[PDB]
Design a protein around this ligand. Structure first.
Ligand SMILES: O=P(O)(O)O[C@H]1[C@H](OP(=O)(O)O)[C@@H](OP(=O)(O)O)[C@H](OP(=O)(O)O)[C@@H](OP(=O)(O)O)[C@H]1OP(=O)(O)O
Length: 113
């Protein structure tokens, strides 16, 4: 999916990743067993990575605006939740809040004009 994102099929990659995250969340909900602890942990890490890629691609395509910020914050909060001990997810979430607040400042300045 990442490769096909790199191969100019960006919107298709984003849609496929939406579907994949939904499917894998359903699988994780269905994955309820004692032996499945390590597999569930790996799947949670994969969900974190998928959500991080979701946010990155959402910014790459739709940019940053009033509509995009809630969705991307949801994606990054989910990514942090699935894998709390991951540096990339937390850094992406924090810098995303940073970008959102700077964008709010800039549009406020535009309003002032
Ligand atoms: O183990 P991978 O499947 O290769 O995933 C990660 C990660 O990939 P994702 O962000 O897509 O999960 C990084 O991001 P990408 O470059 O793959 O987009 C990647 O590279 P960076 O950390 O430099 O972004 C990083 O390391 P690598 O460059 O060696 O692929 C690698 O983690 P690992 O290095 O632990 O395998």
């Amino acid at each position: 999916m990442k490769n096909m994102w790199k191969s100019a099929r960006k919107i298709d990659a984003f849609q496929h990743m939406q579907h994949f995250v939904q499917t894998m969340q359903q699988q994780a909900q269905h994955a309820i067993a004692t032996e499945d602890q390590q597999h569930k942990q790996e799947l949670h890490k994969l969900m974190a990575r998928c959500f991080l890629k979701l946010g990155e691609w959402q910014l790459n395509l739709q940019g940053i605006n009033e509509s995009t910020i809630p969705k991307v914050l949801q994606y990054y909060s989910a990514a942090t939740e699935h894998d709390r001990s991951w540096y990339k997810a937390w850094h992406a979430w924090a810098v995303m809040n940073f970008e959102a607040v700077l964008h709010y400042k800039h549009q406020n300045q535009a309003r002032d004009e």
